[PDB]
Amino acid sequence: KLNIDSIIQRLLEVRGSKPGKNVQLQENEIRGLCLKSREIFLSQPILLELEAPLKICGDIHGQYYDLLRLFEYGGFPPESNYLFLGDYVDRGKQSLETICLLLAYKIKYPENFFLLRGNHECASINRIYGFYDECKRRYNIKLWKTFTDCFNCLPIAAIVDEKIFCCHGGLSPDLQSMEQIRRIMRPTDVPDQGLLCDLLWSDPDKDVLGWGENDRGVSFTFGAEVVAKFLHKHDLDLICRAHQVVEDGYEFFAKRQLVTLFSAPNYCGEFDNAGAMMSVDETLMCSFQILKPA
């Protein structure tokens, strides 16, 4: 029943327009995106094992016209393969269009386009930071619930070519084995502590070395020694995460053993930050494309 091509065409029709212009899909169409993407998310592993070549993006937060920007720099699907690290909704003004385009591409190109869960893909959080209000304002609360059901099935982490470990937040002191991630059962809401919480909420910290307390009031911080041991233990070369704004769009930590990516330029209209996108080529060489704020 679902006309994906037409949905994608209408979402892209506003390319070039000044930021703010809405796209108005029918409720039934959005509901269809959620239900069909949810089938796909559940049919694929919770810990994705992906291969290069690949583009990797961090937080978007409903900045739809920045998402379009990313695709014009990186290549509209299927010209490149994509992995997004979560935080698609909240704070920005066009979360619906952001998430709709992402889900549409996921349905169209399920083997070449991937979405991880971020900490905002949780109903207790996106109720407060804007997605609930955007849904209510534009459609209704029932549609917001349909999105939650779909968010609850997103995968949590990826390993790219057995060398790059990717997740929204970062590491967990509870993470002894990758099998622990593969055993996480979907759908689920994100608990307030534990492994799943930490993957979506933790942060690197330059002033600690081991594990520390996190100023967010949830989860932990980790230092360079945690990072080194994790990579040595699992025979990995790099951790790739998002979750924090970085002035330059990306930022290395711990002698380039971790990188933070952030893909929303001029975040909230408040910050003066650039957005970045990481390319991994077949040789596992990492490059960056930078989108300066306009």
User: Is there a contact between 216 and 203 (Cβ–Cβ < 8 Å)?
Assistant: yes
Residues that bind Mn ion (CB under 5 A): 59, 87, 118-119, 243
Annotated catalytic residue, options 120, 131, 200, 277: 120
Binding-site residue numbers are: 59, 61, 87, 119, 168, 243
**Nearest residue (beta carbon) to Mn ion:** 87
Q: Residue 100 and residue 73: Cα distance in Å, rounded?
A: 20
By beta-carbon proximity to Mn ion, the closer residue of 77 and 118 is 118
By beta-carbon proximity to Mn ion, the closer residue of 14 and 99 is 99
Provide the minimum distance between the beta carbon of 59 and Mn ion in the complex, in angstroms, as a whole number: 4
By DSSP bridging, strand 82-84 and strand 113-115 are parallel
By beta-carbon proximity to Mn ion, the closer residue of 92 and 223 is 92
- Indicate the DSSP class of residue 222: E
Counted residue by residue, the chain has a size of 294
By DSSP bridging, strand 250-253 and strand 258-261 are antiparallel
Provide the minimum distance between the beta carbon of 103 and Mn ion in the complex, in angstroms, as a whole number: 19
Structure tokens at 54: 């690949």
By beta-carbon proximity to Mn ion, the closer residue of 81 and 119 is 119
Structure tokens at 138: 């534009």
User: Is there a contact between 286 and 278 (Cβ–Cβ < 8 Å)?
Assistant: yes
Q: Tell me the residue type at 2.
A: L
Structure tokens at 193: 């502590």
Provide the minimum distance between the beta carbon of 175 and Mn ion in the complex, in angstroms, as a whole number: 18
Angle at 120 between CA 152 and CA 157, to 5 degrees: 60
Query: Within a 10 A sphere around the Cβ of 218, how many other Cβ atoms?
Result: 16
Provide the minimum distance between the beta carbon of 61 and Mn ion in the complex, in angstroms, as a whole number: 6
Known catalytic membership, residue 120: yes
In the sheet with 157-160, reading across from the earlier edge strand, the strands are 47-50, 157-160, 164-167, 238-241, 258-261, 250-253
User: Is there a contact between 182 and 45 (Cβ–Cβ < 8 Å)?
Assistant: yes
By beta-carbon proximity to Mn ion, the closer residue of 31 and 117 is 117
Provide the minimum distance between the beta carbon of 166 and Mn ion in the complex, in angstroms, as a whole number: 14
Binding-site residue numbers for Mn(2+) are: 59, 61, 87, 119, 168, 243
User: Is there a contact between 129 and 135 (Cβ–Cβ < 8 Å)?
Assistant: no
Q: Residue 221 and residue 201: Cα distance in Å, rounded?
A: 9
Catalytic residues: 120
